[PDB]
């Protein structure tokens, strides 16, 4: 019970899912790269961090 | 072109595609002309004296 509580738990700690919504207007390759300047949002090669 | 770049493009097109303006050009050449010639002379020969 416990053990499988720990596993589901470690499961649904580290989530990791996309979400599409719809942009109407400015341009989504300036949206990549006015945010890929958000350095550090997934983009890093963090060791013991595991950013990736 | 990107979502932003067709709003400008769409302002762009709407200014360029303005009603254009109609003239209607009316040109008035006047020319007038005239002169005088006069040519009057008189000549007299006799068989005795001379001529001219």
Redesign the interface.
């Known amino acids: 019970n416990r053990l499988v509580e720990v596993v589901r738990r470690v499961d649904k700690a580290g989530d990791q899912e996309v979400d599409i919504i719809k942009?109407?207007?400015?341009?989504?390759?300036?949206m990549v790269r006015l945010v890929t300047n958000l350095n550090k949002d997934g983009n890093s090669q963090g060791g013991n961090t595991s950013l990736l | 072109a990107q979502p932003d770049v067709m709003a400008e493009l769409e302002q762009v097109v709407a200014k360029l595609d303005i009603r254009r303006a109609q003239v209607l050009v009316e040109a008035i050449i006047v020319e007038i002309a005239d002169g005088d010639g006069l040519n009057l002379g008189v000549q007299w020969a006799n068989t005795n004296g001379g001529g001219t």
């Not at chain 1, 942009?23 to 300036?30: C, D, F």
């Open positions: 942009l109407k207007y400015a341009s989504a390759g300036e």
